[PDB]
Ligand binder design. Structure first.
Ligand code: A1AJ3
Lengths: 39, 156
């Protein structure tokens, strides 16, 4: 059985930690909702 | 139960202790999460029941109590924030410039941030605080790190 618990407000935070790159990838989406890389 | 707008953890007592299987967004009386989090099962909020209303395995999305309400989109240029809600950890905003998933049916923004599986359903927001999609369905690249699509539904 599943239950939900509040975890916070949805707001933009000024001075949040900035991380992560921006890759451009060729991908395919199958009927099961799974993404895969095309090369 | 609790219907206040915000980000929520999705928990289960079926496995060892209380385990966080994902995250979701409550907006306008509707709870929004990824399909793989709940598999379309009913949810509890205190003494109240949340019944699925719409879902789609290919989009990997599901809404409870009403139709999908989130319609903001990434503008294709600006930085965004993942409001990551990791298991057992406080909600934390992480700012990133999205990459792109290029498909035969069009392009979609992607966020290159790695978090535990139970973080799926965490919202991605724009500078106005609008939810432009949920985090948690994506791919593992050459290196071994995770890249999630910015998955958004359609507000009918
Ligand atoms: C038929 C379909 N169900 S979900 C979906 N999603 C598309 C819409 C644009 C690109 C996408 C994200 C991946 O091919 N397309």
């Amino acid at each position: 059985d599943m239950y939900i618990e509040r975890a916070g407000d949805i707001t933009w935070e000024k001075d949040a930690e900035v991380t992560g790159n921006s890759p451009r990838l060729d991908v395919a989406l199958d009927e099961s909702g799974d993404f895969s890389l095309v090369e | 139960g609790e219907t206040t707008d915000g980000v929520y953890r999705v928990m289960t007592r079926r496995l060892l202790g209380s385990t966080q299987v994902g995250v979701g967004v409550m907006q306008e009386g509707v709870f929004h999460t990824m399909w793989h989090v709940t598999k379309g099962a009913a949810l509890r909020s205190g003494e109240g029941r949340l019944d699925p209303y719409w879902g789609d395995v290919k989009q990997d999305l599901v809404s409870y109590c009403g139709p999908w309400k989130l319609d903001a989109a990434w503008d294709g240029l600006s930085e965004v924030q993942l409001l990551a809600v990791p298991p057992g950890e406080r909600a934390k905003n992480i700012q990133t410039l999205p990459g792109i998933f290029k498909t035969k049916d069009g392009d979609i923004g992607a966020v290159a941030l790695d978090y535990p599986a139970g973080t799926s359903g965490s919202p991605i927001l724009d500078k106005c605080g609008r939810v432009i999609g949920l985090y948690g369905n994506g791919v593992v690249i050459k290196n071994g790190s995770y890249v999630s699509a910015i998955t958004q539904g359609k507000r009918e």
